[PDB]
Amino acid sequence: MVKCDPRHGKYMACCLLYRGDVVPKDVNAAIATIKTKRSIQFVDWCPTGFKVGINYQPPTVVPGGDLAKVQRAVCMLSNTTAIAEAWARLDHKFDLMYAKRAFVHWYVGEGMEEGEFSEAREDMAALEKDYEEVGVDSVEGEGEEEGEEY
Amino acid sequence: HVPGGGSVQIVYKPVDLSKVTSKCGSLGNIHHKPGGGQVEVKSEKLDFK
């Protein structure tokens, strides 16, 4: 329900949030088999990727409207390297108009400064390197290493 | 006496348009003005220094 594809990076953190007809074994096995899938890839430093909540109470819906009942439901909250493509979209979209100084006069006519505008873009150029570094497989020499097979 | 009249002269006079002079605003020009400035000066290449 963010459109960036989670194949495009690596999970760091997850929270599962169940409601209704759910028992904790069923969940532990749902999580372990997602954990097993190294296609559901996690950053190569993360071991304990999941946090888990379980409510007894089901979601009710509003009457007459588009959302229908289920016996069990799940929300999920997950931090992932794959969203660096949308931050890169917010880079590119800023850079293309700011190279021309397009729409600037509306903000600067409220007395805001060109200095602050440039620091905001600079903080997001740091943010691109923040997502990129957590994306590194904890490299600390001149290459990477492996056992016999993954 | 010699009758038959003396002489009488005709009223006739030559004509000219007097090299007359007026105003003309259009006569004071032969060339058009050069164009305005078609070039951007605000653009920036966004180098992180």
Written in H, E and C, the secondary structure of B5-49 is CCCCCCCCCCCCCCCCCCCCCHHHCCCCCCCCCCCCCCCCCCCCC
User: Cα(A45)–Cα(A47) distance, rounded to whole angstroms?
Assistant: 7
Rounded Cα gap, residues A61 and A142, in angstroms: 55
Q: Do A20 and A71 form a contact (C-beta atoms < 8 A)? A: yes
Q: Is the dihedral of CA A72, A80, A123, A106 positive or negative?
A: negative
Residues of A in contact with B49 (CB under 8 A): none
Which residues in A lie closer than 8 A to residue B45 (C-beta atoms)?
Answer: 99
To the nearest whole Å, the CA of A102 is away from the closest chain B CA by 9
Q: Which pairs from B38-43 meet CB under 8 Å and 24+ separation?
A: B40/A100, B42/A100, B42/A101, B43/A99, B43/A100, B43/A101
Q: Which residues of B have a CB under 8 Å from any CB of A?
A: 40, 42-46, 48
A121 contacts in chain B (CB < 8 Å): 46
C-alpha to C-alpha distance for A9 and A85, rounded to whole angstroms? 9
The distance of Cα B42 from the centroid of its chain, to the nearest Å, equals 45
Structural domains of chain A in order of their starting residue, each with its CATH number: 1-82 (3.30.1330.20), 83-140 (1.10.287.600)
Rounded to the nearest 5 degrees, what angle is found at the Cα of A12, between the Cα atoms of A9 and A13?
A: 130
Determination method here? cryo-EM
CB contact under 8 A, B43 and A100: yes
A16 SS3 class: strand
Where does residue A25 rank: exposed (0-12), middle (13-18), buried (19+ CB within 10 A)? exposed
Helix, coil or strand: residue A141: coil
Length of chain B: 49
Query: In a 10 Å sphere around its CB, with 0-12 CB exposed, 13-18 middle and 19+ buried, how is residue A39 labelled?
Result: exposed
Whole-angstrom CA distances from A37 to A26, A47, A77, A81 are 17, 14, 19, 17
The pair of structure tokens assigned to A146 is 């492996």
Task: Say what the resolution is, in angstroms.
Answer: 4.1
Say how many Å lie between the first and final Cα of chain A, rounded: 31
- Contacts from B45-48 at CB under 8 Å and sequence distance 24+? B45/A99, B46/A95, B46/A98, B46/A99, B46/A121, B48/A122, B48/A125
Phi-psi region of A52 (alpha: psi -120 to 50; beta: other; left: phi over 0): beta
Query: DSSP secondary structure string, A17-72?
Result: EEEES--HHHHHHHHHHHHH-TTSPBPTT-S--EEEEEESSPPP--TTSS----SE
Q: In A, what residues contact B, Cβ < 8 A?
A: 95, 98-101, 121-122, 125
Give me Rg for the CA atoms of chain B.
38
Is the separation of the CB atoms in A67 and A61 below 8 Å? yes
What is the least distance, in Å, from the CA of A142 to any CA of chain B?
27
Cβ distance of B44 and A99 shorter than 8 Å:
yes
Contacts of B26 (CB under 8 A, 6+ apart): none
Mutation choice for B interface testing from A92, A97, A100 by most B CBs within 10 A = A100
